[PDB]
């Protein structure tokens, strides 16, 4: 199979630099024009840079010209994107894609895409999450089902991983997209378990935040009053 894998994305403060890297395999790399394409939090797709098979011809839109430099190394099968003086507008998932063969003819641009590396440009400092147990109040009407949750609040940057009972509980689990609450992300997760299996059995939510190298385990304990 033809394969393209990105790397080099991370967090940077505005005005800083970064270098993205795309490896190619399963085809003659030097015959194909390559581009980079970004996807914004809004879901918008934007073409960002193109280089010819021979390296000689590059092109950019006006939003990145002067700031971004597409580059390739045919011997090593690599495509790079030198990014500089980054701003919060450059935060996106950055894709690596091949368009056309240099040998006639010309149809179908972007047929193979990478998985994408995430760039986030922000001055907001890295912050581990606060993890809070969500248990029903000590008076609530109880049914055959009981829904518990975990609230994961005030962290930065994305992502965070939430699992329940180390992942051995995956039924009736809803994890909700994070939302910006003024420079910090907030997210919650929800699990629904049979009435009997709680609190007679233990439910724990596990939260990992790679960027702050932080993992938190929280047991959902029935609230006493």
């Amino acid at each position: 199979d033809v394969k393209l894998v990105e790397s080099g994305g991370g967090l940077v403060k505005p005005g800083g630099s970064l270098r993205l890297s795309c490896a190619a395999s399963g085809f003659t790399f030097r015959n194909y024009g390559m581009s980079w394409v970004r996807q914004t939090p809004e879901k918008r797709l934007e073409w960002v840079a193109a280089i010819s098979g021979n390296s000689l011809y590059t092109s950019y839109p006006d939003s990145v010209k002067g700031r971004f430099t597409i580059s390739r190394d045919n011997a090593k099968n690599n495509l790079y994107l030198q990014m500089s003086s980054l701003r919060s507008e450059d935060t996106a998932l950055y894709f690596c894609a091949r368009h056309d063969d240099y040998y006639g003819k010309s149809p179908y641009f972007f047929d193979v895409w990478g998985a994408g590396t995430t760039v986030t440009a922000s001055s907001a400092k890295t912050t581990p999450p606060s993890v809070y147990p969500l248990a029903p109040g000590s008076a609530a009407q109880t049914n055959s089902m009981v829904t518990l949750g975990c609230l994961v609040k005030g962290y930065f940057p994305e992502p965070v991983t939430v699992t329940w009972n180390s992942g051995s509980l995956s039924s009736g689990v809803h994890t909700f997209p994070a939302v910006l609450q003024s420079d910090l992300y907030t997210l919650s997760s929800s699990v629904t378990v049979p009435s009997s299996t709680w609190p007679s059995e233990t439910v724990t939510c596990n939260v990992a935040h790679p960027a702050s190298s932080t993992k938190v385990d929280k047991k959902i304990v029935p609230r006493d009053c």
Binding site: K43, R44, L45, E46, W47, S59, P61, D62, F95, H99, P107, Y108, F109, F110, D111, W113, G114, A115, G116, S130, Y132, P133, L134, A135, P136, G137, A139, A140, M145, T147, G149, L151, K153, H174, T175, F176, P177, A178, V179, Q181, T186, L187, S188, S190, T192, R223
Partner: protein, 216 residues
């Protein structure tokens, strides 16, 4: 730059039916050689765009006959017949005719199903959080259809539309329902000044109000 506008934004179909996604241009995308390099991509959650139609109306490799593209000058259509579950996702149109090449906004293809009222749970703030000087009241609204619902907050009977954060999930691929969490952020001191906290889901329209409360 050639501005591509897609409509509608979201589109629910019953599996087996037909769907039509439109894509408009702000100027001609006929290239100097007379050819129109319009392309349609499909993107599924977690995955990268896959090329479906290229050059207005040519099916790419392994793309099923049910996809067909057409259109003339500034107007281009994607028709999907016999919509299967694997066809669900976001559809972008693209033009490779003039630099810079631009994409459309996208159109979400979602599946129709039977109406389902939400399951609503309300949670007081955890005592952990209270020790930090904050208090978040959380409300889960789980497994409803359709996507649209109105969530009302009440504190001591008084409506609160203020610092409320709402978040939806994608359509659940097993049962085609949606879920939502709604969070009320207060200070610890604001929290203690009030007794009654209520979370209202409303559809009118559908299944009459679903109220969930707690006190202290």
């Amino acid at each position: 730059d050639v501005l591509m506008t897609q409509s509608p934004l979201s589109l629910p179909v019953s599996l087996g039916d037909q769907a039509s996604i439109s894509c408009r241009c702000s100027q001609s995308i006929v290239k100097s050689n007379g050819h129109t390099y319009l392309e349609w991509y499909l993107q599924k959650p977690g995955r990268s765009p896959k090329l479906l139609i290229y050059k207005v109306s040519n099916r790419f490799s392994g793309v099923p006959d049910r996809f067909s593209g057409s259109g003339s000058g500034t107007d281009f259509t994607l028709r999907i017949s016999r919509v299967e579950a694997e066809d669900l996702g976001v559809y972008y149109c693209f033009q490779g005719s003039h630099i810079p090449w631009t994409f459309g906004g996208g159109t979400k293809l979602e599946s129709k199903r039977a109406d389902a009222a939400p399951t609503v749970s309300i949670f007081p703030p955890s005592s952990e959080q209270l020790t930090s000087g904050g208090a978040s009241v959380v409300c889960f609204l789980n497994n409803f259809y359709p996507k649209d619902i109105n969530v009302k907050w009440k504190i001591d009977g008084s409506e609160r539309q203020n610092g409320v954060l709402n978040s939806w999930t994608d359509q659940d691929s097993k049962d085609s329902t949606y879920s939502m969490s709604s969070t009320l952020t207060l200070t610890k001191d604001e929290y203690e000044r009030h007794n009654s906290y209520t979370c209202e889901a409303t559809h009118k329209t559908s299944t009459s109000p679903i109220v969930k409360s707690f006190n202290r």
